[PDB]
Amino acid sequence: IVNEK
Amino acid sequence: SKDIVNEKLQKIIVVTDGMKRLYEYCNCKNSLETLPSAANYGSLLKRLNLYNLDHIEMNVNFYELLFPLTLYNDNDNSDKTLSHQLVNYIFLASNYFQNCAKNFNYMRETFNVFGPFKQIDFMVMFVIKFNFLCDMRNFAKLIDELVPNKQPNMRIHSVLVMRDKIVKLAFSNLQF
Amino acid sequence: RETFNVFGPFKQIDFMVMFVIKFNFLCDMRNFAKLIDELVPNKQPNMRIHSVLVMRDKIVKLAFSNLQFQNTKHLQRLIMLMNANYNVI
Amino acid sequence: RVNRCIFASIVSFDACITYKSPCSPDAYHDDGWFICNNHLIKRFKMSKMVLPIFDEDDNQFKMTIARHLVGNKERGIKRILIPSATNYQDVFNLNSMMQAEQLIFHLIYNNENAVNTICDNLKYTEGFTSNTQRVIHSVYATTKSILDTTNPNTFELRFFDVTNARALRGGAGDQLFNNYSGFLQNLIRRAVAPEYLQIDTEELRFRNCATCIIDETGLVASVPDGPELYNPINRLQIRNVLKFEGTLSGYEEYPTYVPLFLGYQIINSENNFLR
Amino acid sequence: LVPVGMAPRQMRVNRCIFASIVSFDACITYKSPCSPDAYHDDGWFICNNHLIKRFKMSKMVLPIFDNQFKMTIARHLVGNKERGIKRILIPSATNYQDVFNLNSMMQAEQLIFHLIYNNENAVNTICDNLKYTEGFTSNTQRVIHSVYATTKSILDTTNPNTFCSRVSRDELRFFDVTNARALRGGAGDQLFNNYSGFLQNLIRRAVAPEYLQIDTEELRFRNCATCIIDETGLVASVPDGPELYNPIRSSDRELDRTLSGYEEYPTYVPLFLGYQIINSENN
Numbered sequence: 001i002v003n004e005k
Numbered sequence: 006s007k008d009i010v011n012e013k014l015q016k017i018i019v020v021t022d023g024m025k026r027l028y029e030y031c032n033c034k035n036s037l038e039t040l041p042s043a044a045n046y047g048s049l050l051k052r053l054n055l056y057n058l059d060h061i062e063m064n065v066n067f068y069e070l071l072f073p074l075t076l077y078n079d080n081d082n083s084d085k086t087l088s089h090q091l092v093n094y095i096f097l098a099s100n101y102f103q104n105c106a107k108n109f110n111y112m113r114e115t116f117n118v119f120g121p122f123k124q125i126d127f128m129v130m131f132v133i134k135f136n137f138l139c140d141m142r143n144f145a146k147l148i149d150e151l152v153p154n155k156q157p158n159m160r161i162h163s164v165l166v167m168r169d170k171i172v173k174l175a176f177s178n179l180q181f
Numbered sequence: 182r183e184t185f186n187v188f189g190p191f192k193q194i195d196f197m198v199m200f201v202i203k204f205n206f207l208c209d210m211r212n213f214a215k216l217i218d219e220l221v222p223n224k225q226p227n228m229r230i231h232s233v234l235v236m237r238d239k240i241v242k243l244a245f246s247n248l249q250f251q252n253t254k255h256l257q258r259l260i261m262l263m264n265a266n267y268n269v270i
Numbered sequence: 271r272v273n274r275c276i277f278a279s280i281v282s283f284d285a286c287i288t289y290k291s292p293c294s295p296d297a298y299h300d301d302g303w304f305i306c307n308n309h310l311i312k313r314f315k316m317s318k319m320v321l322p323i324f325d326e327d328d329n330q331f332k333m334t335i336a337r338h339l340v341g342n343k344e345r346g347i348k349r350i351l352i353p354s355a356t357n358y359q360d361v362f363n364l365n366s367m368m369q370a371e372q373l374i375f376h377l378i379y380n381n382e383n384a385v386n387t388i389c390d391n392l393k394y395t396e397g398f399t400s401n402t403q404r405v406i407h408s409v410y411a412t413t414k415s416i417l418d419t420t421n422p423n424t425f426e427l428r429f430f431d432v433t434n435a436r437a438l439r440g441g442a443g444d445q446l447f448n449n450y451s452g453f454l455q456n457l458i459r460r461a462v463a464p465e466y467l468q469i470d471t472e473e474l475r476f477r478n479c480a481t482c483i484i485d486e487t488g489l490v491a492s493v494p495d496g497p498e499l500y501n502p503i504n505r506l507q508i509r510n511v512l513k514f515e516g517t518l519s520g521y522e523e524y525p526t527y528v529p530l531f532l533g534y535q536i537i538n539s540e541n542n543f544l545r
Numbered sequence: 546l547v548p549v550g551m552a553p554r555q556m557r558v559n560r561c562i563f564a565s566i567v568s569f570d571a572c573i574t575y576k577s578p579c580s581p582d583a584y585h586d587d588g589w590f591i592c593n594n595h596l597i598k599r600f601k602m603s604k605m606v607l608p609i610f611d612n613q614f615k616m617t618i619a620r621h622l623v624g625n626k627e628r629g630i631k632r633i634l635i636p637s638a639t640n641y642q643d644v645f646n647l648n649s650m651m652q653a654e655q656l657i658f659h660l661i662y663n664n665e666n667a668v669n670t671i672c673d674n675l676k677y678t679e680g681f682t683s684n685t686q687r688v689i690h691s692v693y694a695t696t697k698s699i700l701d702t703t704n705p706n707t708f709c710s711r712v713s714r715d716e717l718r719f720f721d722v723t724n725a726r727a728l729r730g731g732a733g734d735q736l737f738n739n740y741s742g743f744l745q746n747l748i749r750r751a752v753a754p755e756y757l758q759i760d761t762e763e764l765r766f767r768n769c770a771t772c773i774i775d776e777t778g779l780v781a782s783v784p785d786g787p788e789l790y791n792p793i794r795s796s797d798r799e800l801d802r803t804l805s806g807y808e809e810y811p812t813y814v815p816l817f818l819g820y821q822i823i824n825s826e827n828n
């Protein structure tokens with residue numbers, strides 16, 4: 001997870 | 006104020022008690038002796054994988070996490086080794102966090118072996134923090150509920166400041 | 182021995198300390214044996230590991246010889262295990 | 271030429287006894303030591319040394335440090351370096367040393383009862399009032415002056431038990447350090463080097479593991495765990511005649527020493543303080 | 546002629562492999578910098594200069610004893626703040642090509658590296674390129690063959706003894722973190738095995754063991770490990786946490802009044818790692 005943040 | 010901090014201490018005790026069974030982990034045998042290993046969390050990692058783990062902070066508020074413990078009846082004037090024990094505890098916590106940050110990648114491969122999932126970047130930190138909090142609960146058990154409303158201690162506060170500065174810098178260095 | 186004596190002036194306290202040490206040791210030995218049960222032993226020991234074992238046993242024996250010291254079925258079985266008499270049954 | 275050679279302020283009050291006092295010159299060095307090298311070696315099994323920290327251009331931080339004189343076989347009393355007040359009388363063979371030295375040790379450890387006993391015993395020396403009391407006064411005054419000088423309370427963030435990983439809990443080595451006298455505390459600071467040095471949020475590690483141990487028995491040249499560190503050391507005779515006149519010789523040697531490495535030193539916003 | 550028929554003469558021999566570096570362009574004269582230590586008949590097959598330049602390592606002696614035995618040992622030149630690839634004290638066969646900048650250095654040294662590290666493909670590539678590059682036949686071919694022969698002679702001297710040491714019973718060495726309760730040690734022995742025979746000999750000559758059991762006596766030189774080994778190779782890293790401060794005081798008033806002639810402890814960081822065992826002295 002590198003974009004859901 | 007420091008009354009709110011006492012509330013924080015009681016809340017962290019109760020909230021640890023809460024999640025250690027809401028998610029039934031209590032890896033309460035472990036401590037801050039050295040870098041944690043996935044070999045003691047395999048099943049705990051499986052249970053963690055059931056949840057999205059991005060809701061975690063890269064840095065650790067070592068200050069606010071440990072300050073409540075500083076509030077205790079040091080005025081008893083019977084166990085200054087208690088204060089020295091607290092100093093040892095805080096310093097070893099800082100070292101534990103520093104080593105975790107320095108070798109965070111190494112733990113990343115460890116948990117790649119154990120449950121190779123995208124959420125490992127958060128699982129590493131969750132293992133770190135949860136083992137740390139189990140150690141905090143054990144330390145609370147060791148100490149007595151002698152928390153005053155307010156207590157000044159320059160030496161302990163200075164140790165906190167200087168060690169946590171290193172801790173925060175190390176955590177910040179976790180680039181990506 | 183003093184830490185164990187905290188729980189009482191037991192008659193055979195020295196034997197008790199030795200037994201506790203060997204028992205804590207046997208726990209991890211059973212752990213290793215479980216870890217290795219699936220694997221196939223060789224007819225003869227690995228020579229390098231054997232040399233290491235002999236060399237370390239030298240030091241262990243030296244230390245425990247320098248430190249001189251002072252209800253039967255299971256007792257004797259476990260004691261034979263402790264004394265490493267693998268003929269135990 | 272102030273001679274700070276504590277344990278050289280010893281006078282053989284007995285006429286038949288002559289005290290050589292063959293002790294090290296460095297006592298005349300206005301350093302942080304209050305005991306010079308030979309006294310240190312004899313009565314604490316320590317050898318003075320210095321550890322440079324910053325030595326580039328003119329920054330010359332040279333932290334002092336002493337070395338173990340204890341092999342890897344000694345244990346218990348044999349290994350204790352600086353005994354506690356509870357056990358120093360046992361570790362040191364006070365009866366085998368001169369009563370003046372015993373008085374010095376008793377003053378250092380605040381054994382006023384032993385001091386009174388020693389002076390009471392000296393009361394019954396033949397030339398007691400003539401010169402024994404003068405010797406008592408001289409030695410006692412010198413020792414008291416040294417002790418007061420060492421004590422900071424008279425008219426900083428160095429922690430010695432705060433390095434020990436794998437320890438269950440407690441530390442308390444700093445507790446015993448506090449319990450020690452000002453002279454003993456200054457000696458420990460002067461000889462023992464904190465394994466870590468933090469300056470204004472800048473940590474330097476000198477060892478990967480502390481070498482000394484501090485507990486109720488005192489300061490011990492022991493290891494945090496495992497076995498002890500290896501620590502080695504004309505009258506013309508017939509054998510002295512040599513036979514007929516006739517291998518890393520080209521490389522330097524790393525000392526086989528065990529310097530006193532233990533503790534964490536924390537320094538606040540203060541910069542590279544060189545005064 | 547003067548000398549007896551054949552009769553191999555006896556003289557000193559430069560031992561560092563890198564001494565053979567020479568410009569393949571005969572029209573370009575080159576001299577490699579060699580420390581005189583290279584002419585000592587010792588276990589070291591690299592001179593101090595090449596060692597420091599390529600591996601960031603400096604030789605050193607460790608007295609051992611009644612009879613004072615001198616055990617070879619190297620020490621870190623790695624600073625405290627160096628990170629990542631900089632911490633690779635000796636790269637592994639899977640990383641040396643990257644750690645060492647083959648492009649930036651001479652072809653002869655690249656061949657030397659591809660020989661030390663068992664890279665036959667790279668060695669063959671270099672050989673063929675030199676065959677089809679420049680006046681190979683005239684003198685470049687002979688120079689290349691001379692360099693290759695020297696390197697192969699050194700390797701043939703080392704590897705048999707290295708293999709005999711590997712299978713040796715009397716002498717045993719284990720390059721890992723003696724603190725088995727650690728994670729940065731790993732299968733250090735397996736990695737050491739992965740290394741070439743000559744590289745294994747270099748590692749033995751450089752890294753001293755944390756402990757040393759001679760017959761029945763054990764000497765503990767450290768309560769900790771000053772370096773580690775991983776897939777990358779020999780890493781100048783602290784296995785447990787913060788890096789050791791390495792002032793690097795040289796090479797690349799009241800305080801002194803008190804600190805006149807006065808024993809001083811060096812700040813160097815020697816290489817201590819693993820367990821070593823020996824029967825008798827063998828010295």
Ligand SMILES: [Zn+2]
Pocket residue numbers: 561563564578579580583591592593594595
């Ligand atoms: Zn050379």
